[PDB]
Structures are given as C-alpha cells and as structure tokens.
Design a protein around this motif. Sequence first.
Motif, PDB file in Angstrom:
ATOM      1  N   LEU A 159      57.024  35.940  -9.533  1.00 14.01           N
ATOM      2  CA  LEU A 159      57.082  34.758  -8.667  1.00 14.01           C
ATOM      3  C   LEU A 159      58.528  34.330  -8.388  1.00 14.01           C
ATOM      4  CD1 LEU A 159      54.160  32.605 -10.155  1.00 14.01           C
ATOM      5  CD2 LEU A 159      54.072  34.632  -8.690  1.00 14.01           C
ATOM      6  N   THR A 160      59.234  35.188  -7.653  1.00 19.29           N
ATOM      7  CA  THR A 160      60.592  34.876  -7.212  1.00 19.29           C
ATOM      8  C   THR A 160      60.529  34.038  -5.937  1.00 19.29           C
ATOM      9  OG1 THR A 160      61.422  36.927  -8.189  1.00 19.29           O
ATOM     10  CG2 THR A 160      62.812  35.830  -6.552  1.00 19.29           C
ATOM     11  N   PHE A 161      60.953  32.777  -6.022  1.00 16.74           N
ATOM     12  CA  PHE A 161      60.981  31.866  -4.886  1.00 16.74           C
ATOM     13  C   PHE A 161      62.377  31.843  -4.276  1.00 16.74           C
ATOM     14  CE2 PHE A 161      56.879  29.931  -5.759  1.00 16.74           C
ATOM     15  CZ  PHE A 161      56.739  30.106  -7.120  1.00 16.74           C
ATOM     16  N   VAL A 162      62.435  31.768  -2.947  1.00 15.67           N
ATOM     17  CA  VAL A 162      63.694  31.705  -2.216  1.00 15.67           C
ATOM     18  C   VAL A 162      63.582  30.645  -1.131  1.00 15.67           C
ATOM     19  CG1 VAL A 162      64.402  34.072  -2.694  1.00 15.67           C
ATOM     20  CG2 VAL A 162      62.958  33.588  -0.710  1.00 15.67           C
ATOM     21  N   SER A 163      64.704  29.990  -0.841  1.00 18.78           N
ATOM     22  CA  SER A 163      64.742  29.006   0.235  1.00 18.78           C
ATOM     23  C   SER A 163      66.193  28.703   0.582  1.00 18.78           C
ATOM     24  CB  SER A 163      64.000  27.724  -0.152  1.00 18.78           C
ATOM     25  OG  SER A 163      64.789  26.924  -1.013  1.00 18.78           O
ATOM     26  N   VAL A 164      66.375  27.849   1.584  1.00 16.89           N
ATOM     27  CA  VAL A 164      67.663  27.233   1.884  1.00 16.89           C
ATOM     28  C   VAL A 164      67.459  25.735   1.705  1.00 16.89           C
ATOM     29  CG1 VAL A 164      69.473  26.849   3.568  1.00 16.89           C
ATOM     30  CG2 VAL A 164      68.351  29.070   3.439  1.00 16.89           C
ATOM     31  N   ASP A 165      67.914  25.206   0.573  1.00 16.85           N
ATOM     32  CA  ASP A 165      67.611  23.832   0.203  1.00 16.85           C
ATOM     33  C   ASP A 165      68.454  22.849   1.006  1.00 16.85           C
ATOM     34  OD1 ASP A 165      65.942  22.308  -1.866  1.00 16.85           O
ATOM     35  OD2 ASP A 165      67.921  21.404  -2.160  1.00 16.85           O
TER      36      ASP A 165
END
Lengths: 546, 217, 220, 217, 240, 230, 233
Positions: free
Chosen positions: E130-136
């Motif tokens: 469960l590797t989560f990625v985003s641009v916060d």
Amino acid sequence: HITNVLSMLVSKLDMNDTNLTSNLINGIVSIAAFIPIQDLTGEDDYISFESDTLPLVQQHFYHIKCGESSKTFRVDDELLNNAFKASTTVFQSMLKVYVEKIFQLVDVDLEDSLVTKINQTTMILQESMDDKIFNYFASLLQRNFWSNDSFKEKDPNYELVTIPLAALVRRNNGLSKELVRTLLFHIKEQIKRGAGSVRSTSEIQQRDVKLVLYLTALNDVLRQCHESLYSDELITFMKYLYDNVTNPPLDVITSIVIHSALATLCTTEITDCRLFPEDSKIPEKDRWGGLQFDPRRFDKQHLSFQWHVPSSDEITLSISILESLSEYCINNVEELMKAPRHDSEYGDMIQKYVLVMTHTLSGSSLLFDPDFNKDIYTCNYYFGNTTEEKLQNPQYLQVHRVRARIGHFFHKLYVFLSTNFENNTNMFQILLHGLKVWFTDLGQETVFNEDPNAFIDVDFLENVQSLSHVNEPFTRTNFAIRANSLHQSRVLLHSTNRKASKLENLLLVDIIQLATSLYPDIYKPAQGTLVHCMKQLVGSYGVVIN
Amino acid sequence: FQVEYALEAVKRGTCAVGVKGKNCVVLGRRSTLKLQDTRITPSKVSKIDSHVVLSFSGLNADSRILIEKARVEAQSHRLTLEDPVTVEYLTRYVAGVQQRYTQSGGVRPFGVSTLIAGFDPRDDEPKLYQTEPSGIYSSWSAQTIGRNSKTVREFLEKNYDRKEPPATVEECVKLTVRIEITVVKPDSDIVALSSEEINQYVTQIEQEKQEQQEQDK
Amino acid sequence: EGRLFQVEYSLEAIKLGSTAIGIATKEGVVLGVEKRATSPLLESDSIEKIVEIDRHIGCAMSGLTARSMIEHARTAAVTHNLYYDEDINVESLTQSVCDLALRFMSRPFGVALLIAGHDADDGYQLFHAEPSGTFYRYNAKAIGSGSEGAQAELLNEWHSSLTLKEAELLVLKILKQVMEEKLDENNAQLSCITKQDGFKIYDNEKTAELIKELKEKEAA
Amino acid sequence: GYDLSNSVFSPDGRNFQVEYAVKAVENGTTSIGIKCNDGVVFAVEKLITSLLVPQKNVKIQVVDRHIGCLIPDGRHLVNRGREEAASFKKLYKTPIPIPAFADRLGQYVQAHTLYNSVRPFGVSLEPSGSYWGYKGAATGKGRQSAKAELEKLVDHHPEGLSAREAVKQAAKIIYLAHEDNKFELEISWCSLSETNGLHKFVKGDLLQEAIDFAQKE
Amino acid sequence: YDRHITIFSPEGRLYQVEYAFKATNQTNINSLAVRGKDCTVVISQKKVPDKLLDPTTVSYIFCISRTIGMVVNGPIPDARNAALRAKAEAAEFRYKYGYDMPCDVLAKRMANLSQIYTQRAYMRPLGVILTFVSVDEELGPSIYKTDPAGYYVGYKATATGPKQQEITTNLENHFKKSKIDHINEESWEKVVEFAITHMIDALGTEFSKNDLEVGVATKDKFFTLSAENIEERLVAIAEQ
Amino acid sequence: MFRNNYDGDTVTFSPTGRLFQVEYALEAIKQGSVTVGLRSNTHAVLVALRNADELSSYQKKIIKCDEHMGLSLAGLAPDARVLSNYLRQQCNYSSLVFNRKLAVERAGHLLCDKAQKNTQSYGGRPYGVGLLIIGYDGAHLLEFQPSGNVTELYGTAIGARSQGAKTYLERTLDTFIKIDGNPDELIKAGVEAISQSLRDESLTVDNLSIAIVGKDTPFTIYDGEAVAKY
Amino acid sequence: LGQIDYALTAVKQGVTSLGIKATNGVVIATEKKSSSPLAMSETLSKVSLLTPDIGAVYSGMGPDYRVLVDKSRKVAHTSYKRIYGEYPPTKLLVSEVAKIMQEATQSGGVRPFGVSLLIAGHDEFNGFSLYQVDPSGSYFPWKATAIGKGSVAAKTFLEKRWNDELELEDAIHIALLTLKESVEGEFNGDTIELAIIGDENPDLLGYTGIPTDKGPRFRKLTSQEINDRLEAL
C-alpha cells in the motif's frame, strides 16, 4: 528400487513442512551412506533406466501389492541389466534437483539442527561420488552459486551453500585458486557499490550480500591446505579489506579470514574420506554396501587414508603472515592511541584491530608451546618433542617472542582503555575475549573447535551406521573420521598448566580488576575469563583471594 | 468430576445437626485462636426470616451467597404475594439455584450443603429439609452434615424414634455433641441460646453420665 | 466416518435409575415407580418420581428428579387451556416436551420420561419421550434398571383386554420381579390416570392392600 | 498444521484452504463464457444420472435482467450478488455496471477468507476472490481443451466474432471438452442486437442448430 | 498456537505478520516510486502471459481520491479490499472535516487498521504494501508506504518487489550523487522517463508499452497513463 | 489405522477438495428406511415403509406442507421437522402476501439455500435427512440431499436397500410415466416398486404409508386400514 | 512464562530511550532507527506530546505506541478535561494509560502491547514527575531510568551520575552522554529525539491577551539545538 526412491525423495523436499524435510533428509543420508554415487555401466552396454529399470520395478510392485510375496516373483539375468547398469545413470538429474532445492531452502527459516543435518547430507553425497560425478557436481554448484535468485531475505542460511563449496576444496584443492580469485573480485565490487558504509552495529541490513562471499572465503580458506603457496595476493587483499571496512558486525566476519589462513597451513587433519578411493582394488560390483559386512573393510589397502601434514614452507608462510599482521595491527592501534577521540569510528577501528589480533593469535595456536617458560601424548608438533630439538629452531623462539609482544601490547591497551575509556563497554568485552584467547590457546584451538564446519560429524555418522552387538559395521568414511577425531582428541589432551610468568600474572591482575566492575555487561565476561585463566594457571586462587 | 469434589469440600466443613420435635425445631464452631476477636462473629445459624432459619456446612463464603439469595427471595415473595415464604418453597428455590449453578461447566457450583428449618406461616407443623449440590433436596426428621455425619446419624437413629417425637423443647435441645443451638417455634419465634445455657446443658449431660456410671459402671 | 454417538450414549439409560413401568388400558393408565430404601427417620414422602402435569396428564421418571421438563409441560398445558379453552392433547404435550429438548440437535438434554394421559380424540395414551427430542407411542413400557426383562414380561403379558386392577397387579408383579421380592408398601409407588378421576396417586394403604391381593393371587 | 484451518498463512505466505477450494472447483463440470461483438454467450454441461426430467434442471441464472452466471455455494453467491444489484438499483436508479458487480462479488468472496470461523467458497471469480476481464473463460473438469479452443478462436478472429456464430462455437467447445469424459447443453445469451441487451436463454430452433453444428464437428 | 495466530512467541515474535511479508511477493511485479519538484511518478510491472486475459482490466494501481493514488504489491483481492477501505476513509474524511484528506493521514489510518489486524487474534493481516503517492497542499510531492506490520513512513523514493534491492541500491547511489531529496525535472514526462530508465538499468531488461503501468500525481490531480502515453514515453527515451 | 485429519468440522477442505462431514451427512440417510417417489403427468405419489417393538407405534414419514405439496423423509427426524416447518412457513407467506400457491421448484430452491448455510458456518452440523417432495397437478417430484442439491426426477428411492426400487423404476419408467387419470394404478406401481426393495419382508396396514396429490386432488395421506390396497 | 514476559522480551529488544528528572524539569531522549537513507526520518516521531505539560517516549513495537498515544490523548480529554476544565495531573494520566494496557492484557483474544513507556510531566501541588509503565499495566515512579536494548549500562551510568542537586542542563548533558555511549548507528541531531518538561513557554501558546493562560511546559528540541549541544560534548 533404491535409486528411483532416491529421486522421489529429492524432488519431494518442501519449503513449508520442516518435519517432512527432516525425514526426507534422513532417508537421503541413509541412502547415500551405503551406496557409491557412480555410473557402473561399462563401455558399450546400450542400456537405459527408462527402458530397463522402470518396467521391472513396476512389474515387481504390482506383483507385491496384488497380494503375493517376493518368493513367487521369478526373474532372469536381465534383472542385472535392470540393476546398477541402468539405475546408476540417473544421478546427475537428482544432483541438479538437490542443488536447486538447497538454493531454495537457503531462504527458509530453519532450525540449526536441520541446517547441520542438511550440510551433513550434502557432504556425505559429495564423498560418495566418483571423480566424474564429483567434477559434474562441483561445476554445477559453482555455476549455481555465481548465478542464482536467492539471498533475498535479511536472515539467509549461508552455510547451506558455503560449507559444501569448501567441502569440494577438501576433496580437490586444485579448484581453490580461481574460485578464490573470483570471490576476491566480487568482494571488491560490493565494496565499490557502497556496502558496509552505513553502521548498523545491532544487526545486518539488506545491503551486504558481500557477506555471502565473505563466508565462502572463510570456509574455502579453511580447506586450501597446501594450495596457497596466491599468498601475496591474499595478504594484500586482507590488508585492503581491513583498511577499507569499518562495521562491527562486518568486522567480526572479516576477522576470520586470517584465522582460516593461519589454521589451514599448520593443522594436522585428514583430507580424504571417500566411500571408495578412485584407485580402489575392490571390483565395482561389491561396492553397493560400503563393505559394511565384509572383512575387507579392515584392510590397510582399503583404508589408506590421505592426511595433511604441514611442511617447512607452510610453517614459514604462517610465521611471516603472523608477524606481518601483528606489526600492522600494533602500529595501527598505536597510531590511534596517539590521538584519542570520542566518536564511534574510533572505537570501531580499535575493536576491529583488536579482533584481528585475537584471530591472528587463534589461527596459529598449534605453533605455541605451553611449556616454553620452563607427556606421552605426542601429537604432530612441527618443532618436535623433548627440548633439544625445539631450542635449535629459531622459528620456535621468534613465534614465542611474537606471542610475548602481543601479550605486552594487550596489557598496554588495557591500561589505555582504563585510563581513557572507563564508561565504554564494547572495547572492554573485545579485550576480555582477546585475553581469553591469549590464555586458552597455548598450543590447541578451542574457540572454533565446537562450531559446525565442513567436516563429517563423528556423532552423526556413528548414529547412522551403528548396530548393537555388531563389531563396527562402518564404511571407509566412518573409519577416516574416527581417526581424525582421535587425533583431535590427542591434540586436545595435553595439559597447559604452568607457573604464571610476569606477563601472565599482570594480565591475571587486569582480569581480576575487570571482574570487580560496576557494569554487568563487563564483569560477567570478565568473571568467565577469570575462571578460564584460573583453570589454565596454577596457584591463581591465592592471588585471586589475596 | 465436579459434584463429587464439591461433596468432598462439603465433607471438610464443620458439623451441623438439625432435629425436629413436636412443636419446635433445633439447629446445631472451631477452636478460635488466642488473638481472634469473638465479639463480632457470624453465627453458623442464620435466620432467613422470622419463621425460617438456615444452617450451612462447607465453604462459608459460598454459603453467604446462598443465604443472601434466600433472604432476597423471601422478601420478594413477601412483596409479591403478601404472604411470607413457606419452608418447602424456600428449600426448592435454594435447590434450584444450586442446580442451575451446577450446569454451565461448573468448576465448583457452590461446594456447600444446607439445612432449612422452621414452620409454615399460620401453622405449627415443624419442617426440616436438607439441600445438597446438584439441586437435590430431601426431607428429614433428624439429619447431620459435616465431618462425622455417619456416627451422628447412627446416634440419632438409635436415639430419636419415629413413633413419639419429643413433646418438650428441653429434651430436643439436650443433645450430645461428643456448640451453637437455635430453637424455632411457631408464630415466628426464633431464639438463639447463649454460652451459659449450653454449658449448663453440657454439665447436665456430664452429671447424668456420672450418675449412670455410679449406678452400674 | 462420523456419527452422533453422544445421542446413542445418552439413550443407554438402562442404568439411569429406578425402574418405572407404565401400562395403558381402556379404563386408565397405571404408572409404577420404585421407591429407594433410605433412612427410617427420613420423610419418604419427599421422594416423588411420579409427577402431575395436569388433571388429565401425568408423568413418570427413572433418573434424578432435578424439573425443567415438568415445568415446561405444565406451562404448555396451562397456556393451551388459556388460549383455546380446552385440554391439550397428550401427543401435543409430548411433542412440546420434545421440541423443548431439541431447542435447548447434536447433544442430548434432560432425561427420559413416561407421559400418560387421556383425551377425547385417542382415549388413553402412553408415550415414552427420550432426551433425543423424540418419542414413541407404547402399549406398556419399562425404563430403568432391569428394563429388558420387564419389557419382555410386558410383551408376554399385555393383551389389550386388561382392566385397571389387572394393570396395577401386572405393574406390581413386574416391579417385584425386577427388585427381587420383598416389596410390601415402601419399595414401590403407584398412580393412575382415568377419565373421571383425572390423575391420582395411590396412598400407602391402597398399595398395601394391592400387595396383599397380589400375594393372595400368587398363593391361589 | 497451516492447512488445517482457513485464514492461516503458511511460512511461504499461502492459504492452503483456498488452494484446496480451487482443487474442489477443478472437480466440477465445464462452464464456458465467450465475449463476442457487443454480447456474451454462456454454455453449461449438465451430466445425466438416470428418471430425470430432461428439461428442468436449469443451472444458468440471471441477475438484474442483464447479467448471466458446489452448486449451492454458487447459488449463495448469486443471491448475494442479486441483493447487491438491487441495492445499487435502488440507490442510483441505473442498472449496476459489470465492473461494479464484479468488484462487489470479489469483495464478498474475499470476506470469507479473513476468518478461520468460515469456509472459503468452492465455486468458479476464483475462490480467493480474484477476478479479471477475459476474452474467453473456461472452468471445470475439461477446462484445458476449452482454453486451447478459445485461444484458437482468438487467434482466428482478430477483428471480433458474431454472437450467432459465438453460440455455435460455444456448443462445439462444450462438446469437445466433454469428449474427454464418457449429458446436456444449456446456452444463455446476452447481446445488444438479438436480445436488446437483456440476458436470455437461447432455445428452440437455434438450440437445435447449435447442437447439430456441434455434433457435425 | 503462536505459529497460527497473532500472539507473541517465546522469543517475542509474531509468526503471522512475517508470513504476510512473504505473501506480499506472490506476484513477480516490481514497483518504483519517485518524486519530482511538482509531481510524483509510480511505475509498476505489468505481466499478462495469458492470451485470453483482457489487459485493460489487469492493474495494481488505484485512484483513491482526486489527488491521492496508490500502488499495491501483493495479491489482488487484498489489494482491492484495501483500496475500497482507503476510498471510503477518504470520502468520510472529506465529509467530516471539510477538506481533502492528506496522503500521510490516509497512510496513518491504514497503518492503524493494520496494527488492529496484528493485535486481534480473530483477524488475519493483509499481505499488501500500500504505497500511497500524492502532491500535498502543504507538503508537496509525497510518498508514504505501509506494511502488514502496521509500520508506515515517508520516502524520497522507494521500490517494492522481489528485486527491490537492486533498485533501492541504484536509487541510493543516485541520491548520494545528486545530494538532493528529489529529481530536478520541471515536467513530469522527464520524471517518468527517468523512472523507466532507472527500472530498465536495475532489472537489466527492456519494456514495451504493454509491460509497464504508470501513474503520475500533480497538484491538480492523480492520473494513470494509457498504453499510448507509455509508448510515446518509450519512443522519447529511445530517441536519446 | 488410517486416521483422517480433515473430517473434524465442515469448514476444512480435504487436500483433494472434499468435505468429509457433508459426505457423512449424506451417508446418514442410509440409516433411515426406504422411501419411493413416482410422478405421472397428472398425479404424484409417495410410498414409505419402523417399529421399536410389538408394543410400539410406527414412525411418521410423510409430512404435509400445504394443501397442494408434501414430502417424505429418510434420516434424522428433527432435521426433517425443521425443514418441513420452514417449508410450511414459506408456503404460508406465499399464500398470504401474494395469494399465490408456491411452486415446487421454488420450494426446492429454498430448501437448497437453507441447507447450504450449515456447510460453511463452523461449530454446527449439516442436516442428516433426505427428502422427496411432490406437488400439485403439472405434477412435480424433487429429491433433496443434505448437501444442497435438488434433482426434479420422474421417480427415485432413498434409504435402507432402496436400490431395488430405483432399478425397478428405471426399468418401468416408460410404463408408469403415462398413467394419467388413474391415480390407483400409479399407487399400485409405487407399491410394487417399494416391494422390490424389501428383503422378503411383507407389507401390512401398520408399516405402509402412502401420499397422493394431483389435479383436482389435494394432498392426501393414507395410513392404517387405508393402505389395504383398496 | 506467559504473554507478558514475551512482551517484556520484545521491549528489551527495542531501542533504548532514557529519562532523567532534575529539580526544575524532566528530560526524555531516544534514538530514531531507520536503516534506509531513502526513508525520511522527520516524518516519524518517537516522542509524542500527550498534554501541554506531559510527554511520553517508548521502547518496543512502534505501531502499538502510535495507537496508544492516540488513545491516551483522547482519554486525557474525555476523562479529566471537559469536567474540571483543566488537564489532568501526571499521576492520573499515567493511571489511565496503565488501565488501558491492563485491559489489553486481560481482554480475551487480544495480545498485550509490546511497549514500555517513559512518561514525563509537571503539575501543580506535585512539581515534576517521571514514570515508567510496563506492558503488564503496572507503573512506577523514577528519578532516572532507561529501557530497551542497552538499558543495563544506561542504568548503571545513571546510578553513578544521578544526585539530588541536578539541574535541567546537567540532566540534558547526562542524557546526551548516555545516548552517545549506546548509539547503534550514527550520532547526530537528525538521529536523536529529545524533549524537556520545564518552564512554561509563552511564545508557543499562539495568542496573547489572557494573563492567566500560560504556555506549554513540553518542548521538543530541534535538530539544530541538538547539534549545538553535541558540539559541547
């Protein structure tokens, strides 16, 4: 039915059921201990396993399971064709499957006893082979070692592969050279990619597959015997390794290279333990039992074991290596003590150098005379017996001078650590281990004598081939390992008790002072070292109480 | 087993004796230590209500729960039916509670036996019942539960007769124990004897035995 | 393979307790139970292995008295009378008891019972209800110690033309045979179920007179 | 030891209970699904035991008028899928999309692999709850020959296949799969042209034509 | 009992979560996540050996929310269960607190759920990463990874799979050379090219447009690239 | 000898994918007596054959679920009682809410769905009874196994050496399939079928029970002096 | 031996952490372990604020501590606050945390937490305080203590170093020396996590205008401050 079953057991090894694998390995050991792994087909037989062995086996099995006994099963001379002539040609596929199963089991969490049993299985299999199958197995093992998809976990079973490899070097030391060279090269590559540059003194992280190579080297260097006179290259590599690596878990492992190198060149031990020698006069038709129930197993021709006896060149090389390493370590530690520091790197370097000193002491243990200051069991002591012969060889005196210098340097290091690093604990533990080695290695080796290695276990093989009320129904391997064990006992039967000298008394006083410490991590090993020294020395109880 | 071990635990308890007479019921302590205060002592004979009394044998802590439940049930019956509980109803309730506790595994349901004595309200017929684990309850005219049991029961059988119950209460009280005595009488009468009265009874027994020995020996 | 052997083990109630025998005739149903020999000072009236479900239904048991089944049967009969202004059938009550055993099937519950009753549909009825949640209609049935010999005697003796007195005599004779003689008035207990009188339990005097009559008949 | 209970991970990281469920699935009869141009065809083999009515033993089921699908485990799964489809229809007023229905079924099946208190499903959507999109699907005892025939059809028709010919292809593949053993064929249809996008059972003249085509092959 | 249920062993171990770590590698797919100055790139192996499969429906990349994407290593049923739970949690957070759930908060919630799985005996752990990625909004390009043991942490770059060690070593050497915490590339296409080249160098093999799956997270949203976009990126890589 | 490690509970699969508890529950039907079911185009019949001793009654095997449907059982009586009560409740719901007589196929579906739940729950037990269901008019006949399977057969037989009756029905299928309009001949055919399954045992008015339902004929149970072949 | 002993073994296998109470404050310090340069250490915190005057550190299983911190933060408001209008004293909060751990130990089907907590705090009428909470659920006050891996040597050093006149700066110096003597890998400001319970800081309150409202006493040191302190060793 044996060889077929021997196949069906090998392919049935599991990665989940450990007890099933233990039972299968027991069966494989029992099969291998009583058959020779060789092709008994002659020049032009034109016989095959599939067309000869399988039909007879199937017919016999159907006859037996139908409700009949083997009494009524009548066969002809073609059974002999269905015998070894066709059943001895299926060994290579079994060996390949076994090697791949071992490389799979490398990444399986297993108990220590099972790992030791599997190593014994592999060694017995190796020693039950003839030259052709042995060469095939060695090539296959090296090929799988240099290219595989294992060692992915952080806790791998290295010894499942490293120990058999050295076993090959035990049977044919001519394979040692290039393999060793390759290891060195690969080691440098791992250092070039940045392995060991992050200190993780607690454990070992998933960045040090180099350890594999390290361990292999150890085992290989443990059984090079006379095939070491690439000496300069190995010495340069050891110096490079000791100057380019600073990691306590890695330093401990790297410190065993010197121990293996020194021990291999000056330890009297056996090297041949084959079930049948290559130049055997026994015909290749009465070999499928190991002569367990035949009087010819007692023949001196059959039991012409091949031993390793150190020569003058090996002793000279060991002495040169010992002196060079001692001088190198002493100079490095003196340079470090010239400008003391308080960071972790300083302590790590000191501990690494002290460990190197300890392993140099332990590797050349057999060259030390417990009665140097001043028997019946006369083992193979290189410098001789009595006292006139010993005093006529300058190497004896220079070795003892080196040992005395090492002891004096140990005392100086203890004084420095006491006066500058009182709160430290790890360096004191390393120093205590060094003093224990220096006191309990006056002519015999006890640090690694109990650890599992690439020798056949005497107790294991005895348990395999023992029947009560029968006078030694053993094989050539069992007799060879028993002779080696008796020699080892005669070596570890001498008395090292002696009057304590000035250096020994001073070191005993230092150990006494360390025994009455405030840190439990320090005085308990100090108490153990004190007990060992009191066992070694005579009259030490009076000093201890006073 | 579970019931047998509970009965064994009962057998280790202090002896208790219950006797019924013509118009009275008589219900029958270890050696206190030198530093034990006897001013505040829970009497072995606990009155459930003004006309029904209870005497336990076995574990005291487990008997306290049964006594409390019996008292609560008696008060609930009084509040629900305006009539005080009868002897048999209360005995059946206690037996049912014990039987319910025997099931559902039952490592130790209660490990205690009980004797329930008294008179039905607006009546003058003595009632004595004995309750044991597994919910079994029985009726008796002279019963004993405790260490001896067999010897005391044999003495009662050879002495107490089921043909002419003792008319007076003094003879019922005058019982050899080889001590606490509680007397239950109709119209909801409960009297607990004192130490002096029991000592007087013991001295009377001793003097009678001495006279019998003097006459015959 | 596998099978529900706990139920079979529970059904082995031959050693469960005292013998109980029921005989159904065209004039009533007789239930006879064995009275245990206890201390002389004990009030034997406190031992009741024959229980009344309601006026037209009675029960007999062989095991320990300690209860839930009898209370449930009484509650079911009262509830049926309240809901339908009539008496519940004997078979309906037996099925209610069996359903109670089943709900509260791989484990047995309760003990075996002999339920006797009368209703206008099937006359006089006798049923044997087992802790397996099932029951059987019977023309006389024996449970408890010595049940096999008693059942064989019932097979040899029952002939569908009996009367109430003959049924009582048979019950007494079989109880004496099972208990091996010496049964005057304190080793047995008798009860009857009849359309007019309902469910009754015989007093000691009537049982003693019946034993005397049985002895006289044996003397002949 | 690890294979004796559900939801237990083996040392290599496997649930042998689901693998045994897959083994049970592999023992079932053949079921085939073909994805044609704007339609899907389903085919089912039905073994004949004896006295059996040849027409009413339907194994094919319909969900929400537009979806086609250990028999009782499959029935339970279909009932749960019907409930989920009805819930979606009531919430959003539109028939549930096929990916949504597949995802809900996968979640429901994966739920029965988390606790040792329940047994994994033994139907075919794999018993582990895994699913994916397929051009052709084959399950059952004779699944390998059906897979080979479906690969042959995929290679032979790179531009798609018609539904009418897909029915005959399914009949032929079912007969070839049953050829291994030594039976009835049920076919169901859902296409935008011949059924207006509603799941239907193809019987009558077209069923006879498909059967004859399969027999001639 | 200590081998089949999540209780402490005499050595203080948990021989049901380590088995979940083993189960995370049932598939043979390697995933790589890097972050740019204003984007985050995730690349995953796509293997479809079967010719009857539909390649469009095979994926290990999920769109949890508008701005947060996830890549899962392990079996697909547990992956979809975790994806559904993450989507539900993100929607609930948006409804409750009135703003978009950050990537680290979602990772922490999933890690707490994993810890609950590890501590309760009747619940088994999920063998997923469960590797989560985003641009916060406040942090920027962010990658946060969890495990079946309930442990989560953020990464500058990360790699998962059976062959993750070589990718990790190459990433460590590259970041040692660059001495910065991200990749200096304004356009996300260059970041995707860098990630693909790094994966090619680490795995020692070439990829087609059907052997890779790409997900890119920007300030506006997170989106998965199509096969044509992957083909164009590979062509651009081959041009130099 | 030959200890089975996968026959403890119903939530464990055999390594070959078997469910041994379900198979044992299926074998539990053999304990019960013999039941035979027929079916014509207009009528359907059931024939059932135990007595504890000469002083006991005979167990009931045929249970009426509604005015147009019924069943016979072989195996565990309480499981049959629970299933029959469930079927009665379902028929009552269908007749009350929709004023519609429940179809036999839907009844079989409900029985299968209910029986499936006991093979996956753990801590319980699968049903241990087999059922033969017959319905109104066209006529229908179902065979229910505790595993959760229904058949919709023309005729069958279950329990205690029922193979002879089944073979007789397989032989005389075409003979008995078209006796429409004559329920008595169908009953006699069923009687002959059940006699084919008896190991020299005779049939009397105390051991034989019959059930009949067809067009214009509500479900009817014959017992006692009514099974005298009249 | 049972589950509690196994949890104690797991705690003994964890990272050390320390705690030192002086006359005018409490000091907590620990080492962050991450054998992966790609991972970012700042995103993970080992010292957590429970109340503006009470903080905690742990040794053992990280996720258990992460859950326990949230539970303790919630119970500090639900139980004491919203009733008396103020934060609970250290003793009552430690008691509540011990109750949570005891319920975890006693509940069926739940394993005990594998962490040991060192909780530092200040309150009126009691001054400063330091406590240790074990996995079993029993808490003990301490003057100076350590847990984890190298806890024996740390305890010996603290016994040789602790006295009655120790101040906050001396406590910080001793804690830094103890951490340096047992640092597993790399000893710098980014691998050391240190916090102090001391004087109230008005600059961290966030607003002005209420004289009675004072700033928090918990203060977490930054990497630069830790590096500056290490430069003085």
